[PDB]
Structures are given as structure tokens and as C-alpha cells.
Structure 1
Amino acid sequence: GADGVGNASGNWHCDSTWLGDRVITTSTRTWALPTYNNHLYKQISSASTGASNDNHYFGYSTPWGYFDFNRFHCHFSPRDWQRLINNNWGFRPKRLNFKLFNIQVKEVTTNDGVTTIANNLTSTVQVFSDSEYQLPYVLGSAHQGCLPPFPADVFMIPQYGYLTLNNGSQAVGRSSFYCLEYFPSQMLRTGNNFTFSYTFEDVPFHSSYAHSQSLDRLMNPLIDQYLYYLNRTQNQSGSAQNKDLLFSRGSPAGMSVQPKNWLPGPCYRQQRVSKTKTDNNNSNFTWTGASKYNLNGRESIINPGTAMASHKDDKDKFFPMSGVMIFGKESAGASNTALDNVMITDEEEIKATNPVATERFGTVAVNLQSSSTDPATGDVHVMGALPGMVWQDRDVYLQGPIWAKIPHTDGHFHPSPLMGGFGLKHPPPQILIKNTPVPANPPAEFSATKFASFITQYSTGQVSVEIEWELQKENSKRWNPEVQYTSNYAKSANVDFTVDNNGLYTEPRPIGTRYLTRPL
């Protein structure tokens, strides 16, 4: 496709269409692309900065921008997300369709505060996708600059940069420098357009259900087992205390003691924190007492950690210090900002199979009891994989990420990305874009020295992404109604998920998917 200047190179396709076991989401946004790094690749590092062994980094920053739609609200509207959630035990991406069009390259001259923009028609913008995955993959890091949830919102394209191997503030021999001009890329003038398609690998359905049973409570409440266990090790004959070995068979009375077939999910304990400041120990323990991992000398906090239930029982006032998803709030700030300006996710429905994140996994025998030594018991705070374990993964949220690239390794384990979503060996590739450098008038005599005088310019266009989602419909024989995500019927000053008098789109709370109930 390509036709003159005065001819639109694409239309506005923004829609969702529901088809029984499929749903197709289509989003279009308008974007703007600045000319980054004044056309230059820059070496970047932590050198001559505040330092901190655990925060050092070596890398590079590119003149290139990139497209990102790794966020559910990029595709589903609230209403849709509701539909999805209330009626489906699962879902996953199948096909992807990406279109880029209506390219407009503007040049801006600015003379004495009086800053004027015009059309540079003959100017070109470059784009290409990393289909062979030869560029460092940044999409799976929950950065900003995705497509706005609100269709009417214009957005700025993120700048692309990457990290290689660092020995604190310094690089090593095996560190990699990638030049994006060393890729074949398609050049577009105003009349041109770029298009491209992708198919997702077979990933399991996201579990958008919650269990209506719990791992420990899986037996028949009416019947005894044919199995026995050691009930008493000391009999009560009024003789105060007197050895003995007494066994009883499993009973509905004593469910906590019946032999069972499975174990709850793995565990890496996290520090508890209360939403009401009072309950909290004084002092600054966010780093000091936070669970973290030690990779080549530097520590990193295990953030969304192993998938664990956020708070036991009623105590909805607690949460793992760094073991849940915390979302912005539009009016929220850089680094200050109180609890009133954020949204904390409650991983509640998974209590049925997963250990609670703040409490311990269980208790282990630690010595060889006998007449002369007492039986001892240790607490277990970290629990690796065990034959017989089962579990759920962290849920996904309307403002949450969708997928992440499984790292290319000799080995991995249940590669569900830890922030939640879909783990893909070959994810939707990175789409790189960039304004093409347009030199200003050169010297009237030749000069070998690098070129520095560029006509400053930027670009705008529309972008369209279309995704085909395969649904896994619900097959429930549950007699009583189910829990659904609903809006509050009652009167209100504002309508959830809308704009205010000032015209700013705002998302009230995070929304997970697990509403419907499947037995275990």
C-alpha cells in the first residue's frame, strides 16, 4: 500500500467482536515520535552516580523508539473485561495483527521563543520488527509508554535502550553492543504504511476461575478412611503419663490429621505490612527486612514473588511487603505518595491451594526423639518444589501485563512470568521505530568531521493492533449464583472508568479475573 500525499493510508479500527469461543479486540491510537538522543547512540552507566553495589548497571541508549501494547487495557474496554471475566473459565491470545499508518513527519523551527511547525513531506520514518529476537527484549519489564487505555488519548513513543553485562559501573569483554541501523528496516514517507502479523505459540489458558474447594478439605465429610495414623504416644489412664502407641482411623471429626494425596504450592516467605500505619513496627525495613536474591554480588528484592495468598482469613488489612502488584493512580507521584494514591492487589482466591505469603509454609521435624531427648520442631520459611505439589499462578489485571519472553536458558521451571500473564518462548516481537535524520545545510567545503547539524523534526501517525483471543467457556453444575464483578448501582458523583469534568480518564481499581468457580 502507498498513494500520494493527500490519501489516507489506513482507517480507524477500534472495536471488539464476540464469537462464542473467540473474541477479537482491535485498538487504534494516535502516537507521537520525538527525535531521541539527537540521532545518537549513547553509552550509559551508573558511573559517577549515587552508586550502590546493588544498583550498578552498564548499557546503551538508542535513537530508536518502540511500540508496546503488553497491557490488557490496551485491548479490552472495562465492559469487555467484565464480559470476559464473568463468563469464562479461561482465555489466551492466538493471533496478532499490527498496522502502522497515516504517517506525518513535521519539522519544527524555533526562532526567538516563536516556535513554528510545518510539514516536511519528503521526510521518512523507519520501522522494523525484531522477528529473529536478536535485540535485547524490554517488553517484559512492565515499563510505561503502552497504548493508552482510553482510545481518545494521544501518546508518546517510549525510547529504546538496553542493559548488557556489567561488573558494577563497568562493562566486560562479553558485553554486547547492538546497532539498530544494522537491521533491514522499511522506510515510510507520508503516503506509505507498515503492516505485519504474528501467531502466538500454544500457552495454557489463564485460569480465570477460583476453586470452590480447598486442598485440605477434599474428602467426603460423611465417611471414615480405611487408613490409620498414630494418634496418641502417651495414654491417659489417670496414671499422669505413661508411654504407649495408639492409632486411630481418619474421621470427619479430625480432618487436619487424615492422610491426603497432595501438597500446597511452593513458598518463599515475605514480611507482613499493615495498611493502617499504627500496627507497624517503627523503623525503615523496606529493604532492610525484605526477602531478596543474591545474583553475582548484588542483591535484588524478590518483588512479585512466588504466587502466594496475600492475607489469611478476614485480615484484609495486611499484605506481603513486596509480594503483590501495586498500580499507579494517575494523580500518584514519582517516589513520595501515600497509600491513598496507589492500588494494592489482593490475591485472595488462591488461598485454596497456595501458602499465605506472610506466614510460614509449615513445620518440620528437626531431631531424633528418644527417651532422653525431646521431639523438636522447626519452622519452614522457604519451600522448593515437591512431588505432589499443586498450585495457581498470580492472577492478571485489566491494567496488568499480558506476556513476557521466557529467557533463553538451558533450563527453566513452570515459566509463568512472575508478575502474571503468559510466558512465551517467542513473544510478539519488538517493533522499532525512528525518525530518519535530515541534515541541515552543510559547509560549502568538504569536512570529514562527524555531522552535527540536523533539521529538528518529529512524527505522528495512528497505530492499530488486533488480537484474537481464544475463550474457554464455563461448564458449571453449581446450583447457587456466582460472584460477578459488578458496578455499584447506587448514586455517585462519578461513573467508574470514565473521564471527569477536566477530561481525564481514570481507572477506579484494579480488576482480576477469578470470579467463577471450578471444583478442585
Structure 2
Amino acid sequence: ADGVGNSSGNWHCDSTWMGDRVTTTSTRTWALPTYNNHLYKQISSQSGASNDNHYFGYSTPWGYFDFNRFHCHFSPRDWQRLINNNWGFRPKRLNFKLFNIQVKEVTQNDGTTTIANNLTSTVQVFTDSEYQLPYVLGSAHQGCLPPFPADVFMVPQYGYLTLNNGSQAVGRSSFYCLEYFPSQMLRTGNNFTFSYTFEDVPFHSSYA
């Protein structure tokens, strides 16, 4: 879309209050490494663990973008404006964008770390809009968008757990390959976007 040298997006971090609506926008800089060396690895609880701590699952080479915390969208002044004046609030719709994607190639020769641009490499992005993957958001996991807009954050590694009989698996355990999903390939100059509408939910009781 923008090849090499044309920006594919702008920095939009702000909030607009219009009557009975507040629209919060946040922009962050993320870093995504290579996870598991491009491999899917079966993971399980260590031998000798207690029965309550036994688990079985899979670790994927993918990362995921988490913004399931209020500090990712509201500044402290925004929070004070929200909670001191409103009896309730609820989300309505969201818009998501990935842009200005740069792929960096890292080499190490004779103890020297050299980083150079890779203008032909891609990143695969897709949204699980059919909810066919285990939903690991909402478990209060680290790796969200940092509360301060100037902070740079690492993209957390995606992984899921399935049925386990101790440290082993059962026949009902499910395995998911994330490359079996249609994904969008983005070079430097390509951007990704999608829009989502929240279902009708009760207003949060922001009152005593």
C-alpha cells in the first residue's frame, strides 16, 4: 500500500467527550519477536506437581494484542472525569489498526549484533472473529498496552490449555494450528484494520 518510505498510519492518542459518549483512542509502539523458533510445542505441567497444578496444552509461535484493561484507553484524568460525573458506562464499538510495520533482521557475527531492515518480509495478522480458538483474553494476563502512551511493549506469546488427565492428554483434547486460519500478510507499507461492535450490556454501576 505504501511500499518503503510512505507511512501507512498516524499517531491518534486522545479522547473526545460528546454528550452521552466518550471516544478514547490510544496508540502504542509494539515489538514482536520470533516465538518458539517458528514451532508449535506441546506443553504440560512438570512431573511431581500437585494434582491441582496439573495441566496440558500447546504453545504457539504467534503473539496476540491485548487491550483488556481500562488504563490502555483512559488516562487518569479521563478516569476522574468519567467516575466523578457518570452513574454508569459501557462500551459500544471499537476500531483497531496495525500500521508502520517494520521487519528487522538480526545477525550475530564474531560477537557483534547487527540489525538491518528487511523490506520484503511479512507479518501475518488475523482476528478470531468466529471464536474458534481458545479465548485466553480475560484471564488477567500481562502484556497489555502500557498505560503510558510513551512506553514500548512486547507482544505476549499466545498459548492455550486443553483437557488433561494429570500431565497427559485425553482423546477429547483439542489441537489448534493458527496457520489453518486465513491471515493477512503485511510488508513494510501495508496496514491492518478491523471494526467491532459490542453487544448490548448493562451499564456498569459506577455509584455507591
Give TM-score scaled by structure 1 length: 0.39
Whole-angstrom distance in 1 between the partners of 2:22 and 2:110: 53
In structure 2, what is the equivalent of residue 293 of structure 1? none
Whole-angstrom distance in 2 between the partners of 1:113 and 1:206: 55
- For structure 2, list consecutive stretches of 5 or more residues without a partner in the other structure: none
The two structures, once aligned, show a CA RMSD in angstroms of 0.6
**What does the per-residue CA deviation read over 1:93-134, in whole Å, with 9 as the maximum and x for residues that have no partner?**
001000000000000001122101000110000000000000
Displacement after TM superposition at 1:71 (Å): 0.1
In structure 2, what is the equivalent of residue 43 of structure 1? 42
Mapped contact 2:2–2:188 kept (Cα < 8 A)? no
In structure 1, what is the equivalent of residue 104 of structure 2? 106
In structure 1, what is the equivalent of residue 13 of structure 2? 14
Mapping 1:109-508, distance limit 5 Å:
109-208=107-206
**What does the per-residue CA deviation read over 1:194-238, in whole Å, with 9 as the maximum and x for residues that have no partner?**
000000000000000xxxxxxxxxxxxxxxxxxxxxxxxxxxxxx
**What does the per-residue CA deviation read over 1:57-87, in whole Å, with 9 as the maximum and x for residues that have no partner?**
0000000000000000000000000000000
**What does the per-residue CA deviation read over 1:380-428, in whole Å, with 9 as the maximum and x for residues that have no partner?**
xxxxxxxxxxxxxxxxxxxxxxxxxxxxxxxxxxxxxxxxxxxxxxxxx
Whole-angstrom distance in 2 between the partners of 1:182 and 1:21: 42
The structure, 1 or 2, with the larger RCO (C-alpha pairs under 8 Å, 6+ apart) is 2
* Identical columns (%): 96
Q: Secondary structure at the match of 2:107?
A: strand
Whole-angstrom distance in 2 between the partners of 1:145 and 1:102: 20
**What does the per-residue CA deviation read over 1:322-343, in whole Å, with 9 as the maximum and x for residues that have no partner?**
xxxxxxxxxxxxxxxxxxxxxx
Displacement after TM superposition at 1:29 (Å): 0.1
Mapped contact 2:45–2:54 kept (Cα < 8 A)? yes
**What does the per-residue CA deviation read over 1:447-481, in whole Å, with 9 as the maximum and x for residues that have no partner?**
xxxxxxxxxxxxxxxxxxxxxxxxxxxxxxxxxxx
Displacement after TM superposition at 1:4 (Å): 1.8
Displacement after TM superposition at 1:141 (Å): 0.1
Mapped contact 2:71–2:147 kept (Cα < 8 A)? yes
Whole-angstrom distance in 2 between the partners of 1:168 and 1:76: 42
Whole-angstrom distance in 1 between the partners of 2:163 and 2:56: 7
Displacement after TM superposition at 1:183 (Å): 0.2
Greater gyration radius:
1
Displacement after TM superposition at 1:47 (Å): 3.9
Displacement after TM superposition at 1:25 (Å): 0.1
Whole-angstrom distance in 2 between the partners of 1:4 and 1:36: 26
- For structure 1, list consecutive stretches of 5 or more residues without a partner in the other structure: 209-520
Q: Which consecutive aligned stretches of 4+ in structure 1 deviate over 2 angstroms post-superposition?
A: none
Whole-angstrom distance in 1 between the partners of 2:187 and 2:154: 20
Whole-angstrom distance in 1 between the partners of 2:91 and 2:174: 32
Whole-angstrom distance in 2 between the partners of 1:4 and 1:198: 28
Whole-angstrom distance in 1 between the partners of 2:103 and 2:51: 43
Q: Secondary structure at the match of 2:43?
A: strand
Whole-angstrom distance in 1 between the partners of 2:86 and 2:20: 9
Q: Secondary structure at the match of 2:195?
A: strand
Q: Secondary structure at the match of 2:90?
A: strand
Q: Secondary structure at the match of 1:39?
A: coil
Mapped contact 2:122–2:188 kept (Cα < 8 A)? yes
Whole-angstrom distance in 2 between the partners of 1:141 and 1:110: 37
Give TM-score scaled by structure 2 length: 0.98
**What does the per-residue CA deviation read over 1:176-196, in whole Å, with 9 as the maximum and x for residues that have no partner?**
000000000000000100000
Displacement after TM superposition at 1:3 (Å): 1.7
Whole-angstrom distance in 2 between the partners of 1:160 and 1:170: 21
